[PDB]
Motif scaffolding. Structure first.
Motif, PDB file in Angstrom:
ATOM      1  N   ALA A  14      31.038 -44.024  -9.933  1.00 22.26           N
ATOM      2  CA  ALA A  14      30.541 -45.173 -10.732  1.00 22.26           C
ATOM      3  C   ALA A  14      31.131 -46.492 -10.253  1.00 22.26           C
ATOM      4  N   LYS A  15      32.403 -46.488  -9.863  1.00 23.52           N
ATOM      5  CA  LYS A  15      33.012 -47.662  -9.255  1.00 23.52           C
ATOM      6  C   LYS A  15      32.242 -48.080  -7.969  1.00 23.52           C
ATOM      7  N   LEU A  16      31.968 -47.101  -7.127  1.00 22.69           N
ATOM      8  CA  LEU A  16      31.251 -47.291  -5.891  1.00 22.69           C
ATOM      9  C   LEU A  16      29.846 -47.847  -6.150  1.00 22.69           C
ATOM     10  N   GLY A  17      29.194 -47.327  -7.195  1.00 24.21           N
ATOM     11  CA  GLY A  17      27.856 -47.763  -7.553  1.00 24.21           C
ATOM     12  C   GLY A  17      27.843 -49.229  -7.968  1.00 24.21           C
ATOM     13  N   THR A  18      28.859 -49.633  -8.734  1.00 30.08           N
ATOM     14  CA  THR A  18      29.045 -51.006  -9.165  1.00 30.08           C
ATOM     15  C   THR A  18      29.348 -51.928  -7.976  1.00 30.08           C
ATOM     16  N   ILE A  19      30.215 -51.495  -7.069  1.00 30.37           N
ATOM     17  CA  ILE A  19      30.460 -52.239  -5.846  1.00 30.37           C
ATOM     18  C   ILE A  19      29.173 -52.534  -5.062  1.00 30.37           C
ATOM     19  N   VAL A  20      28.411 -51.477  -4.762  1.00 32.93           N
ATOM     20  CA  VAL A  20      27.201 -51.651  -3.954  1.00 32.93           C
ATOM     21  C   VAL A  20      26.172 -52.617  -4.587  1.00 32.93           C
ATOM     22  N   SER A  21      26.005 -52.543  -5.903  1.00 30.06           N
ATOM     23  CA  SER A  21      25.114 -53.436  -6.615  1.00 30.06           C
ATOM     24  C   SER A  21      25.643 -54.858  -6.606  1.00 30.06           C
ATOM     25  N   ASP A  22      26.937 -55.001  -6.886  1.00 28.68           N
ATOM     26  CA  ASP A  22      27.585 -56.311  -6.900  1.00 28.68           C
ATOM     27  C   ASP A  22      27.501 -56.978  -5.529  1.00 28.68           C
ATOM     28  N   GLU A  23      27.860 -56.236  -4.484  1.00 26.11           N
ATOM     29  CA  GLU A  23      27.857 -56.749  -3.125  1.00 26.11           C
ATOM     30  C   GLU A  23      26.474 -57.182  -2.669  1.00 26.11           C
ATOM     31  N   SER A  24      25.460 -56.421  -3.036  1.00 25.49           N
ATOM     32  CA  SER A  24      24.110 -56.722  -2.587  1.00 25.49           C
ATOM     33  C   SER A  24      23.499 -57.905  -3.352  1.00 25.49           C
ATOM     34  N   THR A  25      23.801 -58.015  -4.645  1.00 26.78           N
ATOM     35  CA  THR A  25      23.367 -59.151  -5.441  1.00 26.78           C
ATOM     36  C   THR A  25      24.057 -60.409  -4.965  1.00 26.78           C
ATOM     37  N   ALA A  26      25.331 -60.268  -4.584  1.00 30.91           N
ATOM     38  CA  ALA A  26      26.140 -61.415  -4.150  1.00 30.91           C
ATOM     39  C   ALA A  26      25.527 -62.113  -2.946  1.00 30.91           C
ATOM     40  N   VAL A  27      24.737 -61.364  -2.182  1.00 27.97           N
ATOM     41  CA  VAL A  27      24.066 -61.887  -0.980  1.00 27.97           C
ATOM     42  C   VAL A  27      22.536 -61.875  -1.127  1.00 27.97           C
ATOM     43  N   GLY A  28      22.073 -61.806  -2.373  1.00 30.59           N
ATOM     44  CA  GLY A  28      20.648 -61.931  -2.695  1.00 30.59           C
ATOM     45  C   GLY A  28      19.761 -60.785  -2.229  1.00 30.59           C
ATOM     46  N   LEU A  29      20.342 -59.601  -2.116  1.00 30.71           N
ATOM     47  CA  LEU A  29      19.621 -58.393  -1.739  1.00 30.71           C
ATOM     48  C   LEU A  29      19.398 -57.428  -2.915  1.00 30.71           C
ATOM     49  N   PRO A  30      18.318 -56.634  -2.852  1.00 32.48           N
ATOM     50  CA  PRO A  30      18.162 -55.521  -3.777  1.00 32.48           C
ATOM     51  C   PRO A  30      19.192 -54.413  -3.498  1.00 32.48           C
ATOM     52  N   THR A  31      19.637 -53.730  -4.544  1.00 27.32           N
ATOM     53  CA  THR A  31      20.694 -52.733  -4.419  1.00 27.32           C
ATOM     54  C   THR A  31      20.212 -51.513  -3.593  1.00 27.32           C
ATOM     55  N   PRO A  32      20.902 -51.211  -2.470  1.00 26.35           N
ATOM     56  CA  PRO A  32      20.489 -50.069  -1.665  1.00 26.35           C
ATOM     57  C   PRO A  32      20.951 -48.784  -2.288  1.00 26.35           C
ATOM     58  N   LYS A  33      20.371 -47.675  -1.827  1.00 20.49           N
ATOM     59  CA  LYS A  33      20.815 -46.338  -2.168  1.00 20.49           C
ATOM     60  C   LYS A  33      22.193 -46.136  -1.582  1.00 20.49           C
ATOM     61  N   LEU A  34      23.087 -45.546  -2.364  1.00 18.97           N
ATOM     62  CA  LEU A  34      24.413 -45.154  -1.908  1.00 18.97           C
ATOM     63  C   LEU A  34      24.405 -43.662  -1.557  1.00 18.97           C
ATOM     64  N   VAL A  35      24.808 -43.360  -0.330  1.00 20.43           N
ATOM     65  CA  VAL A  35      24.950 -42.001   0.147  1.00 20.43           C
ATOM     66  C   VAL A  35      26.411 -41.824   0.568  1.00 20.43           C
ATOM     67  N   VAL A  36      26.881 -40.592   0.386  1.00 19.79           N
ATOM     68  CA  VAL A  36      28.248 -40.213   0.645  1.00 19.79           C
ATOM     69  C   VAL A  36      28.236 -38.860   1.386  1.00 19.79           C
ATOM     70  N   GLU A  37      29.228 -38.623   2.269  1.00 25.57           N
ATOM     71  CA  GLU A  37      29.267 -37.451   3.189  1.00 25.57           C
ATOM     72  C   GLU A  37      30.549 -36.567   3.062  1.00 25.57           C
ATOM     73  N   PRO A  38      30.793 -35.971   1.892  1.00 26.59           N
ATOM     74  CA  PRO A  38      32.058 -35.245   1.773  1.00 26.59           C
ATOM     75  C   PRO A  38      32.030 -33.890   2.507  1.00 26.59           C
ATOM     76  N   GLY A  39      33.102 -33.573   3.236  1.00 26.61           N
ATOM     77  CA  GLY A  39      33.360 -32.218   3.633  1.00 26.61           C
ATOM     78  C   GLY A  39      34.408 -31.541   2.733  1.00 26.61           C
ATOM     79  N   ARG A  40      35.654 -32.000   2.903  1.00 25.97           N
ATOM     80  CA  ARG A  40      36.858 -31.479   2.232  1.00 25.97           C
ATOM     81  C   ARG A  40      36.708 -31.293   0.735  1.00 25.97           C
ATOM     82  N   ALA A  41      36.051 -32.259   0.131  1.00 26.97           N
ATOM     83  CA  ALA A  41      35.934 -32.368  -1.316  1.00 26.97           C
ATOM     84  C   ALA A  41      34.971 -31.329  -1.881  1.00 26.97           C
ATOM     85  N   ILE A  42      34.177 -30.723  -0.997  1.00 21.38           N
ATOM     86  CA  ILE A  42      33.272 -29.636  -1.393  1.00 21.38           C
ATOM     87  C   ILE A  42      33.907 -28.314  -1.042  1.00 21.38           C
ATOM     88  N   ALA A  43      34.318 -28.180   0.232  1.00 21.69           N
ATOM     89  CA  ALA A  43      34.784 -26.906   0.816  1.00 21.69           C
ATOM     90  C   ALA A  43      36.288 -26.621   0.657  1.00 21.69           C
TER      91      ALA A  43
END
Lengths: 446, 446
Positions: free
Chosen positions: A276-305
Motif C-alpha cells: 500500500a505504501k508502494l501504491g501511494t508512492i507510484v500514484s503520488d510520483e506520477s501525479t507530481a509530473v502530470g501523468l496517469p498512475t501506472p500499473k505497479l508490478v513486483v518480482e519477488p523470488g525469496r519472499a515466495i520460495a
C-alpha cells in the motif's frame, strides 16, 4: 528452553512440535521424513508457499502484478504452483524458459530477463509467444526487433533502468553512477536512447519500465527514490513523444528484493502494508509530473520460495575446538554443506539452526555448523548455539533455505544434490529425487 | 600490442598463436574448438597436466610422494592420467571414492580425507582396500577401529593436525588457536590423545602425520613453521611410546596449497626449488629433535590441474558503463558465469582474460567480464583490460580455470554445465559432455 523456540517469522507457517518433542512440518515429524527420504533433505511446506502467493497477489491487487522470480527456485512442480495461484513467472535464460514450457506454464504470463540474452533465447521466447521481454541493451533491442519482424509479430518489451539506488534491509545508497551490468542509465541519457530505438521500430512495443534495486529490503524508502527516478524518465518520454505513442507505457515494474526473516530479529513489514505504501508512492510520483498512475508490478523470488522450506540434516561429528586459552567453539559437522547451501560462504548469509529430533535440557553452547567438504570455509551457519549434549545421529534443520540454495547447488566433492520433498496436510511426496553415482558419472564419454 | 601477450607462466604450456592471430592449444585453433564443441568450453591441455605430474613427482623424489587432490577436478579420464603418471590420489567423500573406483584407480594409492566421514564411507573405503585414511576426530578413530576389526584388516592411518599456521602467497599467520573444523590441536594435547587412541587398538596402524596450511603458497616459511610444529609432536610421540611402536610413523604429509600464476605478476617458485627447500626443512627439523628423517608427502590440486585448462567463451553483449563524470568501464557479457566459475564471486579470485579469435589493433580500455546470470555479482573477471573494438561474436579465454571451477559448477538459472574437451598433439576429444534440458529435468518426479 530458549534453544527450543521456533520463531514464527522465521519457520514455515505449518511448523509445530510433537508431544515427544519432534518438530513437524504440515503435520509430519521431521524424523519420519529423514527416515523415509534420507538426509540432507529440502522440506517444502506447500501451503506456506501457496499462502505467500495469495497474500502477495492480494497485496498488489492481482496475481497479474506479482511475477515470481524463478531464479529463487524452479522445477516443473513449482511452475505449476505459480500457475494455479495466478501469478506470472520471470525466467532468466533459455533453460528456465524450457523448464517453464515443459511444465505447460502459460507463455503470455512469462517474462524473460537477462543482461546477455542470445539470439537463440530471444528466438525461442517469441516462438513460444512469451508475453514480455525486459530488454537490457541496445544490441538486444536490434536483435529482438529482427526476430519479431521475422515471426510477423509485435513483441511487448520493458526497458530495464539503472537509477543509482541500492537497497538492503533498512538502508539504501544512492550513487551518481551505478557500476554494474544491468540496464541503461536514466541519468546519462542511455535509457532515453533505448526508448527512442524501441519507438522507431515496427515490431516492438514499449509497455513499461523496469528497475531492480536490491535484496532483503525491509523499508519503502529505497523504492521511493527508485520510483521517483523511473517516473522522471516516463515524464521525459511522454514529453518528447507526446501522450499518444506513450499511452501504452502502462507499467512500472520495481523488481524484486522483498525481504524475509532469516533470523528471529529480522523484521520485514507485512506485505499488505508495504504494498500500500508502494501504491501511494507510484500514484503520488506520477501525479507530481502530470501523468496517469501506472500499473505497479513486483518480482519477488525469496519472499515466495524462501520461508516455507527448511534443510534437514543428520549430525555426523561433534568436535570441541579451543578458540582462546579459555573459550571453545562446538563444531557440528553435518550431512552436506556448501554443495546444498553456499550462501553463507558466498554472501555471508546468516541462518537459524535448531535441533529438531528431540528436546534437549542441556545448556546452550557457542557453535559453528559446518559441512563435510574438504575446505575450511565449508561453513553453513557461522555463529550459532547448540545444546551441550548434541550428538551424532541428532537431526538439525536450517530455516528459510527455500530460495537460492538448491538453485545454487553443485556437485563439489562429488556430493550429489539432496532430495526435495513437498508436504501438504500430513502427506509427503518426493518432488526432486536425490542424485546418485550414476548421475555424477553421466556426462562422461566413451 | 601488450594486450595480445599470453604470459607463459599463466597460459597452458602448449599455447601458441596462429599466423591469422588465433590462439591455438596443443596445435588446435581455439576458434575451431568453439565451432566443433560450442561455448562456454573447458579446454584441457593434456600434455601440460601430465608435465606438471611428472615434474612434481621428480621434484619430490617419486610419484608416490605426490598425492593429487581430486577436489580440484575429477572425472574418470583424469583419474586415469593420475594413475598412469604414477601419482597417488586424495579423495574427500564417498562420491570421489566411487568415481576413482569406477575408473579403476588402484585403491592402495588412494587416500581418504574429510572432517565428517560417515560409517558408510569408512566401510566402503576399507572394503575397497584404500591404502590410507587421514583421521580427523576421536569419533572417526572409534568408527574406523570397529570397521577395520570387522574386516579382519589393519588400516593405515595418518592423524590430521592443526598447528596454527595459515599461509598465502608470500606471507603467513601463526595463531595460538586455529578456529576451524579440521584436525586436532598439537598445542592443546588433543593430537596426542588421538595418537594414544590409535596406539590403543590392534586394527589401526599409525603411519604418519598430516598438516594442510593454506593455498597459493609461494614461499616456504609457513611450511617450515608448520613442519617444526608437526615434528615436535613426532618427538613427543616417540618420547612417550619409545622408538618401537613409533618406528612405522614414517611420513610427514604437509598437505597442498602449492601456488600457480593466475596473473602474469604472480611468482611461484619452480617446484624443484621449493621441493628441495622443503626436503631440507624436514631433515633439519627431525635431526634437531634426534629423529630419523621422515618421508615428505605433498597433496597438490591447483598446481596439477589449474594451469593446463582455460575456459573459452563467446562475447554476446558489450556495454559501456559510466562510472564517474569522466570515466567508464566496458562491460563485456559472456556465455557463462558464476555457474562455471564462481571463484571471483566466492573468493575474490583474480583471472587473466584475453581476446583469442583475432588480433586487435584497438587501444586497451578498462573492462569487467561478466556472465549471463540474473544477479549483479555474476562477475567473472572484475578488473581487466580489453581492446576498444571488442564485439559480439569475438572469443575470449580466461586462463587457469582447471582447478575448482568445474568442481564447483552449478545449474544456477538452469544453465547446464559446459562441455570439457582434452587436446593432445593436434587432436581434441570430448571428455565431459555439456548438459542438456533433459539433464536439467532428470531429477523431477511427476
Amino acid at each position: 528452553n530458549e534453544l527450543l523456540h521456533l520463531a514464527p517469522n522465521v519457520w514455515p507457517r505449518n511448523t509445530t512440535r510433537d508431544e515427544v518433542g519432534v518438530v513437524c512440518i504440515a503435520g509430519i515429524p521431521l524424523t519420519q521424513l529423514a527416515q523415509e527420504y534420507g538426509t540432507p533433505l529440502f522440506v517444502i511446506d506447500e501451503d506456506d508457499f501457496r499462502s505467500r502467493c495469495r497474500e502477495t497477489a492480494a497485496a498488489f491487487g492481482s496475481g497479474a502484478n506479482v511475477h515470481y522470480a524463478a531464479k529463487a527456485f524452479l522445477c516443473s512442480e513449482v511452475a505449476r504452483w505459480i500457475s494455479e495461484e495466478g501469478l506470472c513467472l520471470d525466467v532468466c535464460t533459455g533453460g528456465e524458459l524450457a523448464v517453464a514450457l515443459h511444465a505447460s506454464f502459460p507463455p503470455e504470463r512469462i517474462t524473460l530477463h537477462g543482461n546477455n540474452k542470445s539470439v537463440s533465447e530471444l528466438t525461442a521466447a517469441v516462438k513460444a509467444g512469451v508475453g514480455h521481454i525486459v530488454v537490457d541493451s541496445m544490441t538486444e533491442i536490434e536483435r529482438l526487433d529482427a526476430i519479431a519482424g521475422e515471426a510477423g509479430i509485435v513483441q511487448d518489451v520493458l526497458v530495464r533502468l539503472t537509477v543509482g539506488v541500492e537497497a538492503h534491509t533498512h538502508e539504501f545508497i544512492s550513487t551518481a553512477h551505478e557500476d554494474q551490468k544491468f540496464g541503461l542509465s536514466v541519468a546519462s541519457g542511455a535509457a532515453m536512447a533505448a526508448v527512442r530505438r524501441v519507438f522507431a521500430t515496427d515490431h516492438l512495443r514499449l509497455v513499461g519500465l523496469h528497475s531492480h534495486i536490491g535484496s532483503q529490503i525491509f523499508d519503502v524508502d529505497g523504492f521511493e527514490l527508485a520510483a521517483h527516478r523511473v517516473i522522471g524518465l516516463l515524464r521525459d518520454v511522454v514529453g518528447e513523444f507526446g501522450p499518444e505513442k506513450t499511452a501504452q507505457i502502462a507499467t512500472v515494474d520495481l523488481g524484486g528484493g522483498l525481504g524475509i526473516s532469516y533470523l528471529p530479529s529480522d523484521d520485514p513489514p507485512p506485505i499488505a502494508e508495504l504494498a500500500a505504501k508502494l501504491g501511494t508512492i507510484v500514484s503520488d510520483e506520477s501525479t507530481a509530473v502530470g501523468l496517469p498512475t501506472p500499473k505497479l508490478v513486483v518480482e519477488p523470488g525469496r519472499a515466495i520460495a524462501g520461508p516455507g522450506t527448511i534443510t534437514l540434516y543428520e549430525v555426523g561429528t561433534v568436535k570441541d575446538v579451543d578458540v582462546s586459552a579459555t573459550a571453545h567453539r562446538r563444531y557440528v559437522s553435518v550431512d552436506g554443506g556448501m554443495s546444498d547451501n553456499i550462501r553463507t560462504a558466498l554472501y555471508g548469509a546468516q541462518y537459524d539452526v535448531r535441533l529438531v529430533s528431540r528436546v534437549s535440557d542441556a545448556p546452550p553452547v557457542p557453535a559453528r555448523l559446518v559441512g563435510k567438504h574438504c575446505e575450511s570455509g565449508d561453513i553453513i551457519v557461522r555463529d550459532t548455539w547448540v545444546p551441550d549434549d548434541i550428538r551424532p545421529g541428532d537431526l538439525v534443520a536450517v530455516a528459510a533455505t527455500g530460495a537460492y540454495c538448491y538453485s545454487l547447488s553443485s556437485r563439489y566433492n562429488m556430493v550429489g544434490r539432496p532430495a526435495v520433498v513437498a508436504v501438504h496436510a500430513g502427506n509427503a511426496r518426493l518432488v526432486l529425487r536425490r542424485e546418485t553415482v550414476d548421475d555424477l558419472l553421466s556426462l562422461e564419454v566413451r
